[PDB]
PDB file of C-alpha atoms in Angstrom:
ATOM      1  CA  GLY A   1      -0.055  -0.217  -0.243  1.00 11.24           C
ATOM      2  CA  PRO A   2       0.706   3.907  -0.288  1.00 12.39           C
ATOM      3  CA  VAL A   3       3.085   5.141   2.837  1.00 11.66           C
ATOM      4  CA  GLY A   4       2.546   8.573   3.181  1.00 10.49           C
ATOM      5  CA  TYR A   5       0.097  11.646   2.803  1.00  7.62           C
ATOM      6  CA  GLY A   6      -1.383   9.352  -0.495  1.00  4.69           C
ATOM      7  CA  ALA A   7      -2.136   6.757   2.692  1.00  4.45           C
ATOM      8  CA  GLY A   8      -4.817   5.063   2.449  1.00  3.23           C
ATOM      9  CA  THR A   9      -5.287   5.396  -1.087  1.00  2.79           C
ATOM     10  CA  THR A  10      -6.621   1.656  -2.564  1.00  2.50           C
ATOM     11  CA  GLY A  11      -7.853   3.146  -6.235  1.00  4.31           C
ATOM     12  CA  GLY A  12     -10.321   0.675  -7.630  1.00  4.84           C
ATOM     13  CA  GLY A  13      -9.692  -2.048  -5.146  1.00  5.70           C
ATOM     14  CA  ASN A  14     -10.170  -5.714  -5.024  1.00  4.17           C
ATOM     15  CA  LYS A  15     -12.838  -4.758  -8.512  1.00  4.71           C
ATOM     16  CA  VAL A  16     -12.184  -7.568 -11.644  1.00  2.00           C
ATOM     17  CA  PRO A  17     -10.104  -5.208 -13.803  1.00  2.50           C
ATOM     18  CA  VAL A  18     -11.899  -4.071 -17.206  1.00  2.00           C
ATOM     19  CA  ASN A  19      -8.775  -4.573 -19.921  1.00  2.11           C
ATOM     20  CA  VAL A  20      -8.238  -1.438 -21.908  1.00  2.00           C
ATOM     21  CA  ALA A  21      -5.842  -1.436 -24.885  1.00  2.00           C
ATOM     22  CA  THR A  22      -5.950   1.642 -26.374  1.00  2.00           C
ATOM     23  CA  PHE A  23      -6.257   5.010 -25.716  1.00  2.00           C
ATOM     24  CA  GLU A  24      -9.615   5.142 -26.522  1.00  2.00           C
ATOM     25  CA  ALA A  25     -10.900   2.337 -24.512  1.00  2.00           C
ATOM     26  CA  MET A  26      -9.883   3.113 -21.577  1.00  2.00           C
ATOM     27  CA  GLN A  27     -11.152   6.450 -21.987  1.00  2.00           C
ATOM     28  CA  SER A  28     -14.451   4.907 -22.558  1.00  2.00           C
ATOM     29  CA  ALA A  29     -14.388   2.909 -19.462  1.00  2.00           C
ATOM     30  CA  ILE A  30     -14.076   5.917 -17.376  1.00  2.00           C
ATOM     31  CA  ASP A  31     -16.693   7.557 -18.806  1.00  2.00           C
ATOM     32  CA  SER A  32     -19.334   4.601 -18.407  1.00  2.00           C
ATOM     33  CA  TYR A  33     -18.629   4.728 -15.448  1.00  2.00           C
ATOM     34  CA  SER A  34     -20.543   5.925 -12.703  1.00  2.00           C
ATOM     35  CA  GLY A  35     -18.384   8.163 -10.425  1.00  2.00           C
ATOM     36  CA  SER A  36     -17.247   5.643  -7.232  1.00  2.00           C
ATOM     37  CA  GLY A  37     -17.914   2.305  -5.761  1.00  2.00           C
ATOM     38  CA  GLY A  38     -14.504   1.245  -8.065  1.00  2.00           C
ATOM     39  CA  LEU A  39     -13.386   0.888 -10.923  1.00  2.00           C
ATOM     40  CA  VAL A  40      -9.834  -0.955 -12.536  1.00  2.00           C
ATOM     41  CA  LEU A  41      -8.060  -0.666 -15.351  1.00  2.00           C
ATOM     42  CA  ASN A  42      -5.806  -2.742 -16.517  1.00  2.00           C
ATOM     43  CA  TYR A  43      -3.639  -1.041 -19.549  1.00  2.00           C
ATOM     44  CA  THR A  44      -2.653  -3.736 -22.328  1.00  2.00           C
ATOM     45  CA  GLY A  45      -1.339  -1.526 -24.621  1.00  2.00           C
ATOM     46  CA  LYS A  46       1.906  -1.805 -26.043  1.00  2.00           C
ATOM     47  CA  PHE A  47       3.019   1.500 -27.690  1.00  2.00           C
ATOM     48  CA  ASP A  48       6.691   1.195 -29.794  1.00  2.00           C
ATOM     49  CA  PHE A  49       8.355   4.110 -29.165  1.00  2.00           C
ATOM     50  CA  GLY A  50      10.691   3.498 -32.105  1.00  3.06           C
ATOM     51  CA  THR A  51       7.484   4.601 -34.505  1.00  4.90           C
ATOM     52  CA  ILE A  52       9.094   8.049 -33.483  1.00  2.00           C
ATOM     53  CA  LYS A  53      11.486   8.909 -35.591  1.00  2.00           C
ATOM     54  CA  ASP A  54      11.800  12.815 -35.002  1.00  2.00           C
ATOM     55  CA  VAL A  55      11.748  13.618 -31.282  1.00  2.00           C
ATOM     56  CA  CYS A  56      10.374  16.972 -32.605  1.00  2.00           C
ATOM     57  CA  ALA A  57       7.184  16.093 -34.281  1.00  2.00           C
ATOM     58  CA  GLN A  58       5.376  15.953 -30.835  1.00  2.00           C
ATOM     59  CA  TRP A  59       5.154  19.236 -30.267  1.00  2.00           C
ATOM     60  CA  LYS A  60       3.795  20.452 -32.895  1.00  2.00           C
ATOM     61  CA  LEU A  61       0.604  17.507 -32.568  1.00  4.16           C
ATOM     62  CA  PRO A  62      -2.626  17.550 -30.483  1.00  2.57           C
ATOM     63  CA  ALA A  63      -2.174  15.899 -27.327  1.00  2.18           C
ATOM     64  CA  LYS A  64      -3.442  12.600 -26.013  1.00  2.21           C
ATOM     65  CA  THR A  65      -4.494  12.650 -22.773  1.00  2.00           C
ATOM     66  CA  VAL A  66      -6.867  10.455 -20.731  1.00  2.00           C
ATOM     67  CA  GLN A  67      -9.438  12.215 -18.390  1.00  2.00           C
ATOM     68  CA  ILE A  68     -10.717  10.665 -15.179  1.00  3.95           C
ATOM     69  CA  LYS A  69     -13.117  13.785 -14.141  1.00  6.21           C
ATOM     70  CA  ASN A  70     -15.481  14.311 -11.412  1.00  2.16           C
ATOM     71  CA  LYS A  71     -14.877  10.444 -10.812  1.00  2.87           C
ATOM     72  CA  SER A  72     -13.455   8.662  -7.751  1.00  4.72           C
ATOM     73  CA  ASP A  73     -12.446   5.154  -6.259  1.00  2.00           C
ATOM     74  CA  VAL A  74     -10.540   4.602  -9.661  1.00  2.00           C
ATOM     75  CA  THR A  75      -6.878   2.855 -10.298  1.00  2.00           C
ATOM     76  CA  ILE A  76      -5.035   3.089 -13.537  1.00  2.00           C
ATOM     77  CA  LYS A  77      -2.491  -0.458 -13.772  1.00  2.00           C
ATOM     78  CA  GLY A  78       0.193  -0.881 -16.638  1.00  2.00           C
ATOM     79  CA  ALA A  79       0.655  -4.468 -17.333  1.00  2.00           C
ATOM     80  CA  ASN A  80       4.168  -5.693 -17.726  1.00  2.00           C
ATOM     81  CA  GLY A  81       5.194  -4.636 -20.741  1.00  2.00           C
ATOM     82  CA  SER A  82       2.814  -1.967 -21.521  1.00  2.00           C
ATOM     83  CA  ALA A  83       4.015   1.233 -22.801  1.00  3.33           C
ATOM     84  CA  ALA A  84       1.528   4.203 -23.674  1.00  3.67           C
ATOM     85  CA  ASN A  85       2.482   7.559 -25.810  1.00  3.42           C
ATOM     86  CA  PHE A  86      -0.857   9.241 -24.094  1.00  4.80           C
ATOM     87  CA  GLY A  87      -0.683  11.205 -20.604  1.00  2.98           C
ATOM     88  CA  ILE A  88      -3.155  10.880 -17.827  1.00  4.10           C
ATOM     89  CA  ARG A  89      -5.161  13.515 -15.999  1.00  2.00           C
ATOM     90  CA  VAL A  90      -7.154  13.409 -12.570  1.00  2.00           C
ATOM     91  CA  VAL A  91      -9.352  16.922 -12.510  1.00  2.00           C
ATOM     92  CA  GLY A  92     -11.954  18.479 -10.128  1.00  2.00           C
ATOM     93  CA  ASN A  93     -13.986  16.482  -7.540  1.00  2.00           C
ATOM     94  CA  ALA A  94     -12.069  13.442  -7.969  1.00  2.00           C
ATOM     95  CA  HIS A  95     -10.622  11.103  -5.079  1.00  2.00           C
ATOM     96  CA  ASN A  96      -9.020   7.345  -4.041  1.00  2.00           C
ATOM     97  CA  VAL A  97      -7.371   7.387  -7.543  1.00  6.11           C
ATOM     98  CA  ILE A  98      -3.871   5.400  -8.022  1.00  5.96           C
ATOM     99  CA  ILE A  99      -1.697   5.055 -11.216  1.00  6.60           C
ATOM    100  CA  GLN A 100       0.638   2.735 -11.213  1.00  2.28           C
ATOM    101  CA  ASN A 101       2.649   0.616 -13.590  1.00  4.94           C
ATOM    102  CA  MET A 102       2.708   3.004 -16.658  1.00  6.10           C
ATOM    103  CA  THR A 103       5.429   3.839 -18.924  1.00  9.35           C
ATOM    104  CA  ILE A 104       4.516   6.935 -20.451  1.00  8.62           C
ATOM    105  CA  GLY A 105       6.974   8.135 -23.270  1.00  7.71           C
ATOM    106  CA  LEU A 106       7.593  11.256 -25.887  1.00  7.40           C
ATOM    107  CA  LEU A 107       4.288  12.866 -25.669  1.00  5.92           C
ATOM    108  CA  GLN A 108       2.438  14.843 -28.236  1.00  6.19           C
ATOM    109  CA  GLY A 109       0.949  18.394 -27.564  1.00  6.51           C
ATOM    110  CA  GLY A 110       4.269  20.424 -26.524  1.00  6.62           C
ATOM    111  CA  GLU A 111       2.845  22.850 -23.666  1.00  6.33           C
ATOM    112  CA  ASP A 112       0.327  20.347 -23.528  1.00  5.63           C
ATOM    113  CA  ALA A 113       1.889  17.411 -23.297  1.00  7.11           C
ATOM    114  CA  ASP A 114       1.685  16.413 -19.720  1.00  5.19           C
ATOM    115  CA  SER A 115       2.242  13.196 -18.411  1.00  2.83           C
ATOM    116  CA  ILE A 116       0.452  12.417 -15.110  1.00  2.87           C
ATOM    117  CA  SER A 117      -1.315  15.751 -14.022  1.00  2.00           C
ATOM    118  CA  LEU A 118      -3.417  16.735 -10.813  1.00  3.82           C
ATOM    119  CA  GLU A 119      -5.728  19.482 -10.719  1.00  2.52           C
ATOM    120  CA  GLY A 120      -8.229  21.367  -8.628  1.00  2.00           C
ATOM    121  CA  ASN A 121     -11.055  23.356  -9.882  1.00  2.00           C
ATOM    122  CA  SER A 122     -14.412  25.505  -9.476  1.00  2.00           C
ATOM    123  CA  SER A 123     -16.019  21.996  -8.815  1.00  2.00           C
ATOM    124  CA  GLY A 124     -13.595  20.824  -6.157  1.00  2.00           C
ATOM    125  CA  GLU A 125      -9.623  18.752  -5.579  1.00  2.00           C
ATOM    126  CA  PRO A 126      -8.582  15.799  -6.289  1.00  2.00           C
ATOM    127  CA  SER A 127      -7.344  14.094  -2.995  1.00  2.00           C
ATOM    128  CA  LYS A 128      -6.036  10.558  -2.088  1.00  2.00           C
ATOM    129  CA  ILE A 129      -3.700   9.866  -5.105  1.00  2.00           C
ATOM    130  CA  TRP A 130      -1.296   7.192  -5.224  1.00  2.00           C
ATOM    131  CA  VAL A 131       1.178   8.200  -8.151  1.00  2.00           C
ATOM    132  CA  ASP A 132       3.853   4.372  -8.015  1.00  2.10           C
ATOM    133  CA  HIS A 133       5.762   2.588  -9.852  1.00  2.00           C
ATOM    134  CA  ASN A 134       5.559   4.702 -13.485  1.00  2.00           C
ATOM    135  CA  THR A 135       8.576   5.247 -16.000  1.00  2.00           C
ATOM    136  CA  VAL A 136       8.233   9.234 -17.384  1.00  2.00           C
ATOM    137  CA  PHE A 137      10.217  10.071 -20.301  1.00  2.00           C
ATOM    138  CA  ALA A 138      10.770  12.287 -23.232  1.00  2.00           C
ATOM    139  CA  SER A 139      14.011  14.262 -24.072  1.00  2.00           C
ATOM    140  CA  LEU A 140      16.488  17.027 -23.313  1.00  2.00           C
ATOM    141  CA  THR A 141      16.165  18.701 -26.873  1.00  2.00           C
ATOM    142  CA  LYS A 142      14.870  22.181 -27.138  1.00  2.00           C
ATOM    143  CA  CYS A 143      12.902  21.885 -30.872  1.00  2.00           C
ATOM    144  CA  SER A 144      13.295  24.849 -33.378  1.00  2.00           C
ATOM    145  CA  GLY A 145       9.779  27.275 -33.022  1.00  2.00           C
ATOM    146  CA  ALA A 146       8.911  25.292 -29.643  1.00  2.00           C
ATOM    147  CA  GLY A 147       9.760  28.120 -27.270  1.00  2.00           C
ATOM    148  CA  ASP A 148      10.521  26.742 -23.959  1.00  2.00           C
ATOM    149  CA  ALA A 149       8.088  23.943 -24.965  1.00  2.00           C
ATOM    150  CA  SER A 150       9.253  20.981 -26.667  1.00  2.00           C
ATOM    151  CA  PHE A 151       7.386  18.785 -24.324  1.00  2.00           C
ATOM    152  CA  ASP A 152       5.176  19.862 -20.971  1.00  2.00           C
ATOM    153  CA  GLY A 153       5.029  18.195 -17.625  1.00  2.00           C
ATOM    154  CA  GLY A 154       6.246  14.863 -15.910  1.00  2.00           C
ATOM    155  CA  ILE A 155       4.099  14.221 -12.026  1.00  2.00           C
ATOM    156  CA  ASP A 156       2.311  17.568 -11.980  1.00  2.00           C
ATOM    157  CA  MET A 157      -0.428  18.705  -9.427  1.00  2.00           C
ATOM    158  CA  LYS A 158      -2.199  21.988  -8.992  1.00  2.00           C
ATOM    159  CA  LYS A 159      -4.836  24.565  -7.535  1.00  2.00           C
ATOM    160  CA  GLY A 160      -4.971  22.841  -4.097  1.00  2.00           C
ATOM    161  CA  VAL A 161      -4.434  18.541  -4.934  1.00  2.00           C
ATOM    162  CA  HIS A 162      -4.353  17.371  -1.691  1.00  2.00           C
ATOM    163  CA  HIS A 163      -2.860  14.058   0.392  1.00  2.00           C
ATOM    164  CA  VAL A 164      -0.890  12.622  -2.524  1.00  2.00           C
ATOM    165  CA  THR A 165       2.015   9.869  -2.553  1.00  2.00           C
ATOM    166  CA  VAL A 166       4.491  10.161  -5.721  1.00  2.00           C
ATOM    167  CA  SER A 167       6.467   7.017  -4.634  1.00  3.38           C
ATOM    168  CA  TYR A 168       9.115   4.608  -6.900  1.00  7.58           C
ATOM    169  CA  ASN A 169       8.538   6.311  -9.894  1.00 10.22           C
ATOM    170  CA  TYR A 170      11.472   6.378 -12.116  1.00 12.83           C
ATOM    171  CA  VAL A 171      11.591  10.287 -14.672  1.00 11.02           C
ATOM    172  CA  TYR A 172      14.376  10.678 -17.263  1.00 11.64           C
ATOM    173  CA  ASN A 173      15.267  12.889 -20.028  1.00  9.79           C
ATOM    174  CA  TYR A 174      12.671  15.175 -18.734  1.00  8.91           C
ATOM    175  CA  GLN A 175      13.470  18.769 -18.906  1.00  5.33           C
ATOM    176  CA  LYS A 176      10.633  19.611 -16.314  1.00  5.16           C
ATOM    177  CA  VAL A 177      10.099  16.632 -13.653  1.00  6.17           C
ATOM    178  CA  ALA A 178       7.103  17.774 -11.011  1.00 10.71           C
ATOM    179  CA  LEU A 179       5.016  20.788 -10.748  1.00 10.03           C
ATOM    180  CA  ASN A 180       3.114  21.125  -7.323  1.00  7.24           C
ATOM    181  CA  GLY A 181       1.289  24.586  -7.715  1.00  7.89           C
ATOM    182  CA  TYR A 182       1.170  26.451 -10.884  1.00 10.64           C
ATOM    183  CA  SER A 183       1.934  29.749 -10.192  1.00  9.71           C
ATOM    184  CA  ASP A 184       2.631  32.920  -7.521  1.00  7.24           C
ATOM    185  CA  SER A 185      -1.333  33.520  -7.384  1.00  7.91           C
ATOM    186  CA  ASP A 186      -1.932  29.725  -6.699  1.00  7.36           C
ATOM    187  CA  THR A 187      -2.441  30.018  -3.125  1.00  7.27           C
ATOM    188  CA  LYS A 188      -5.687  27.001  -2.908  1.00  6.81           C
ATOM    189  CA  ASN A 189      -1.982  25.230  -3.365  1.00  7.51           C
ATOM    190  CA  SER A 190      -1.171  25.995   0.744  1.00  4.26           C
ATOM    191  CA  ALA A 191      -3.545  22.975   1.055  1.00  5.41           C
ATOM    192  CA  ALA A 192      -0.749  20.465  -0.747  1.00  6.21           C
ATOM    193  CA  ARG A 193      -0.175  17.858   0.890  1.00  6.27           C
ATOM    194  CA  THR A 194       2.782  15.843  -0.745  1.00  4.75           C
ATOM    195  CA  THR A 195       5.179  12.925   0.247  1.00  5.78           C
ATOM    196  CA  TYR A 196       7.901  12.479  -2.835  1.00  7.56           C
ATOM    197  CA  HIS A 197       9.685   8.556  -2.017  1.00 13.01           C
ATOM    198  CA  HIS A 198      12.218   6.244  -3.529  1.00 12.79           C
ATOM    199  CA  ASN A 199      12.024   7.899  -6.954  1.00 13.11           C
ATOM    200  CA  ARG A 200      14.690   7.924  -9.372  1.00 11.78           C
ATOM    201  CA  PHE A 201      15.552  11.231 -10.942  1.00 10.44           C
ATOM    202  CA  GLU A 202      18.163  10.990 -13.994  1.00 13.05           C
ATOM    203  CA  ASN A 203      18.951  13.216 -16.618  1.00 10.21           C
ATOM    204  CA  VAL A 204      16.650  15.971 -15.559  1.00 12.94           C
ATOM    205  CA  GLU A 205      16.878  19.540 -15.949  1.00 13.57           C
ATOM    206  CA  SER A 206      14.636  21.423 -13.536  1.00 10.31           C
ATOM    207  CA  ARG A 207      11.437  20.977 -10.967  1.00 11.26           C
ATOM    208  CA  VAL A 208      11.947  18.532  -8.815  1.00  8.32           C
ATOM    209  CA  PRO A 209       9.620  19.509  -7.339  1.00  7.42           C
ATOM    210  CA  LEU A 210       9.244  23.194  -7.874  1.00 10.02           C
ATOM    211  CA  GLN A 211       7.198  23.528  -4.881  1.00  8.28           C
ATOM    212  CA  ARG A 212       4.915  26.648  -4.447  1.00  6.39           C
ATOM    213  CA  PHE A 213       2.977  26.846  -0.953  1.00  5.77           C
ATOM    214  CA  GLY A 214       1.840  23.587   1.200  1.00  7.00           C
ATOM    215  CA  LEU A 215       3.793  21.108   3.082  1.00  5.33           C
ATOM    216  CA  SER A 216       5.831  18.283   1.268  1.00  4.70           C
ATOM    217  CA  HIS A 217       8.214  15.234   2.493  1.00  5.91           C
ATOM    218  CA  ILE A 218      10.622  14.639   0.311  1.00  6.64           C
ATOM    219  CA  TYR A 219      12.947  11.254   1.425  1.00  8.96           C
ATOM    220  CA  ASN A 220      14.611   8.151  -0.481  1.00 10.38           C
ATOM    221  CA  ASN A 221      15.302   9.619  -3.448  1.00 11.94           C
ATOM    222  CA  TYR A 222      17.751   9.561  -5.983  1.00 14.51           C
ATOM    223  CA  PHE A 223      19.089  12.186  -7.837  1.00 13.99           C
ATOM    224  CA  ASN A 224      21.326  12.335 -10.606  1.00 12.98           C
ATOM    225  CA  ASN A 225      22.575  14.490 -13.876  1.00 11.83           C
ATOM    226  CA  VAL A 226      20.324  17.367 -12.784  1.00  9.83           C
ATOM    227  CA  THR A 227      21.765  19.882 -14.657  1.00  6.48           C
ATOM    228  CA  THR A 228      19.364  23.322 -13.853  1.00  6.68           C
ATOM    229  CA  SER A 229      17.704  22.675 -10.369  1.00  7.94           C
ATOM    230  CA  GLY A 230      16.867  20.590  -7.814  1.00 10.09           C
ATOM    231  CA  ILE A 231      14.055  20.470  -5.359  1.00 13.45           C
ATOM    232  CA  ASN A 232      12.845  24.246  -5.696  1.00 11.44           C
ATOM    233  CA  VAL A 233      10.456  25.348  -2.655  1.00 11.18           C
ATOM    234  CA  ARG A 234       8.853  28.497  -3.110  1.00 10.71           C
ATOM    235  CA  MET A 235       5.777  31.005  -1.509  1.00  9.34           C
ATOM    236  CA  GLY A 236       6.169  29.536   1.525  1.00  8.78           C
ATOM    237  CA  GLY A 237       6.035  26.248   1.035  1.00  8.91           C
ATOM    238  CA  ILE A 238       7.941  23.820   3.502  1.00  8.20           C
ATOM    239  CA  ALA A 239       9.511  20.549   2.691  1.00  7.58           C
ATOM    240  CA  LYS A 240      11.008  18.346   4.806  1.00  3.38           C
ATOM    241  CA  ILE A 241      13.793  16.774   3.171  1.00  6.56           C
ATOM    242  CA  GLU A 242      15.090  13.531   4.417  1.00  4.49           C
ATOM    243  CA  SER A 243      17.638  10.299   3.455  1.00  5.65           C
ATOM    244  CA  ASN A 244      17.613  11.155   0.000  1.00  8.23           C
ATOM    245  CA  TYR A 245      20.834  10.405  -2.456  1.00  8.94           C
ATOM    246  CA  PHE A 246      22.190  13.690  -4.005  1.00 13.38           C
ATOM    247  CA  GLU A 247      24.742  13.682  -6.939  1.00 16.76           C
ATOM    248  CA  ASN A 248      25.731  15.058 -10.544  1.00 17.38           C
ATOM    249  CA  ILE A 249      23.109  18.198  -9.102  1.00 17.29           C
ATOM    250  CA  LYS A 250      23.242  21.597  -9.427  1.00 14.11           C
ATOM    251  CA  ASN A 251      21.646  23.586  -7.188  1.00 14.46           C
ATOM    252  CA  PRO A 252      19.892  20.063  -5.038  1.00 17.79           C
ATOM    253  CA  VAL A 253      17.962  22.677  -2.803  1.00 19.54           C
ATOM    254  CA  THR A 254      17.026  25.748  -3.891  1.00 23.18           C
ATOM    255  CA  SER A 255      14.393  28.657  -3.190  1.00 21.23           C
ATOM    256  CA  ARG A 256      14.332  30.668  -6.435  1.00 18.93           C
ATOM    257  CA  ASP A 257      12.151  32.854  -9.518  1.00 17.77           C
ATOM    258  CA  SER A 258       8.741  33.045  -6.841  1.00 20.07           C
ATOM    259  CA  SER A 259       8.177  36.607  -5.102  1.00 18.87           C
ATOM    260  CA  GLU A 260       7.963  34.853  -1.430  1.00 20.17           C
ATOM    261  CA  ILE A 261      10.541  32.074  -0.963  1.00 20.11           C
ATOM    262  CA  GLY A 262      10.004  28.605   0.358  1.00 19.59           C
ATOM    263  CA  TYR A 263      12.256  26.758   3.138  1.00 21.64           C
ATOM    264  CA  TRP A 264      13.523  23.566   4.252  1.00 25.39           C
ATOM    265  CA  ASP A 265      14.054  21.543   7.263  1.00 25.82           C
ATOM    266  CA  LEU A 266      17.348  18.798   5.946  1.00 25.28           C
ATOM    267  CA  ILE A 267      18.486  15.486   7.849  1.00 26.32           C
ATOM    268  CA  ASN A 268      20.154  12.871   7.316  1.00 28.11           C
ATOM    269  CA  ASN A 269      20.575  14.061   3.226  1.00 29.39           C
ATOM    270  CA  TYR A 270      23.729  11.851   1.216  1.00 28.79           C
ATOM    271  CA  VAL A 271      25.409  14.575  -0.465  1.00 29.21           C
ATOM    272  CA  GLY A 272      28.082  12.388  -3.432  1.00 32.92           C
ATOM    273  CA  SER A 273      30.088  14.281  -5.859  1.00 33.44           C
ATOM    274  CA  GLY A 274      29.218  16.547  -8.029  1.00 33.10           C
ATOM    275  CA  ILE A 275      27.534  18.912  -7.123  1.00 33.32           C
ATOM    276  CA  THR A 276      27.208  22.525  -8.226  1.00 35.10           C
ATOM    277  CA  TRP A 277      25.434  25.774  -7.647  1.00 37.84           C
ATOM    278  CA  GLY A 278      24.327  28.712  -9.343  1.00 40.12           C
ATOM    279  CA  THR A 279      22.466  32.531  -9.318  1.00 39.85           C
ATOM    280  CA  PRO A 280      19.257  32.923 -10.503  1.00 37.88           C
ATOM    281  CA  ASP A 281      19.140  35.561 -12.804  1.00 35.24           C
ATOM    282  CA  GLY A 282      16.892  38.000 -12.414  1.00 36.34           C
ATOM    283  CA  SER A 283      16.004  40.322  -9.688  1.00 30.14           C
ATOM    284  CA  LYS A 284      13.774  38.149  -7.013  1.00 29.16           C
ATOM    285  CA  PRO A 285      15.256  36.475  -3.882  1.00 30.82           C
ATOM    286  CA  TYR A 286      16.627  33.524  -3.594  1.00 31.20           C
ATOM    287  CA  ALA A 287      18.279  30.772  -1.617  1.00 32.14           C
ATOM    288  CA  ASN A 288      20.971  28.077  -1.563  1.00 33.63           C
ATOM    289  CA  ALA A 289      21.146  25.226   0.524  1.00 32.82           C
ATOM    290  CA  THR A 290      25.384  25.025  -0.086  1.00 31.87           C
ATOM    291  CA  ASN A 291      25.871  23.882   3.931  1.00 28.59           C
ATOM    292  CA  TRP A 292      22.881  21.944   3.871  1.00 31.65           C
ATOM    293  CA  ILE A 293      21.013  23.887   6.680  1.00 30.30           C
ATOM    294  CA  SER A 294      17.480  23.698   7.557  1.00 29.14           C
ATOM    295  CA  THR A 295      15.886  26.759   7.186  1.00 26.66           C
ATOM    296  CA  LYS A 296      12.841  26.121   8.840  1.00 30.06           C
ATOM    297  CA  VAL A 297      11.836  23.202  11.187  1.00 25.99           C
ATOM    298  CA  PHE A 298       8.857  21.466   9.696  1.00 30.74           C
ATOM    299  CA  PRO A 299       5.876  23.213  11.227  1.00 29.44           C
ATOM    300  CA  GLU A 300       3.571  19.686  12.071  1.00 27.49           C
ATOM    301  CA  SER A 301       3.416  15.895  12.596  1.00 27.80           C
ATOM    302  CA  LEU A 302       3.286  14.415   9.131  1.00 29.64           C
ATOM    303  CA  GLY A 303       0.820  12.087  10.933  1.00 27.67           C
ATOM    304  CA  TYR A 304       1.889   9.049   9.423  1.00 26.97           C
ATOM    305  CA  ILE A 305       4.634   5.970  10.182  1.00 26.27           C
ATOM    306  CA  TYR A 306       7.153   5.745   7.530  1.00 26.65           C
ATOM    307  CA  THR A 307      10.601   3.247   7.139  1.00 27.41           C
ATOM    308  CA  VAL A 308      13.556   5.239   6.098  1.00 29.90           C
ATOM    309  CA  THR A 309      16.190   3.220   3.970  1.00 31.50           C
ATOM    310  CA  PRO A 310      19.457   4.404   4.900  1.00 31.29           C
ATOM    311  CA  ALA A 311      20.745   7.451   2.810  1.00 27.69           C
ATOM    312  CA  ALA A 312      24.040   5.640   1.569  1.00 28.39           C
ATOM    313  CA  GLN A 313      21.589   2.770   0.157  1.00 30.40           C
ATOM    314  CA  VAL A 314      19.288   4.959  -1.792  1.00 35.00           C
ATOM    315  CA  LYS A 315      20.834   5.153  -4.693  1.00 34.77           C
ATOM    316  CA  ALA A 316      20.961   0.790  -5.182  1.00 34.63           C
ATOM    317  CA  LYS A 317      17.684   0.902  -3.498  1.00 35.19           C
ATOM    318  CA  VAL A 318      16.119   3.296  -5.758  1.00 36.33           C
ATOM    319  CA  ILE A 319      17.950   1.766  -9.091  1.00 38.96           C
ATOM    320  CA  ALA A 320      16.842  -1.549  -8.125  1.00 36.82           C
ATOM    321  CA  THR A 321      12.906  -0.945  -7.464  1.00 36.12           C
ATOM    322  CA  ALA A 322      11.847   2.562  -9.405  1.00 37.73           C
ATOM    323  CA  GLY A 323      10.080   2.889 -12.414  1.00 39.25           C
ATOM    324  CA  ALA A 324       7.216   0.278 -14.481  1.00 41.29           C
ATOM    325  CA  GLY A 325       8.704  -3.368 -14.590  1.00 41.49           C
ATOM    326  CA  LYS A 326       9.384  -3.218 -11.961  1.00 35.17           C
ATOM    327  CA  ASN A 327       6.451  -6.027 -10.200  1.00 35.11           C
ATOM    328  CA  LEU A 328       5.656  -3.026  -7.886  1.00 33.13           C
ATOM    329  CA  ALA A 329       9.298  -4.112  -5.918  1.00 33.04           C
ATOM    330  CA  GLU A 330       9.951  -1.747  -2.848  1.00 32.80           C
TER     331      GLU A 330
END
């Protein structure tokens, strides 16, 4: 089961899985679903990524995105060996959702190419979400004419999504990994309570995660080849950053580019070789955790039980367990 703020999430539970071979079949099954009681989707499609001969063709094309909107008690689970060239969106009054064992790569849509997106709106805010053992990848290439958006977000949430565990995911060859709060005006995101643990972040650029407002617990994650910035805490957000494994990373723990800074509680982090630091371009206030000193104590009890992997062992543990196709190993 899920550990952290997403604890108790069961999704569709023990319901007999509905086999869905395609993007369209998955959507149809969601559309037909009453909205509560339980739905389990077994995704069996095997997208061949070799069919994409030009990484820069993607941003120009419309997005392919499955929507779970105002529906609850849903499991989306990739079968072993399954692969998707479509993203997933959970929006509005939608609760108790599991997204697990999906391999999501090289999505169409550019700025609209969101891999896993959780979003509150005027109808409500998603809660009790478990994003677990997924593999998410794209390209670091900056395509001609695409602006800043050859691809979009990896594992994102905004507008007050709360009580979420993001665990054992593998995100690689990806520019913008994880958004948490979409802008400095996203004040509803003060309700965000997110646990990021045992994730593998490798050959990525930034937003690992980008946190605006709320509280987070970021523990037992492995960072390698993160080239712009790592954990970016902003807008009064506080992150408990515990027993992670950092190496070959620029600005691993920082606060930058918001009108107001965010804070961190640092304990037992493994700091390896290849740590670099930089000063952000602009006028806004910033902070770099150059000496790994805490800027705020985590203001409240987490309210859950968790087992920490010894920090030095995190690299090996995460490599062994993170991502899809790992039989959900922990």
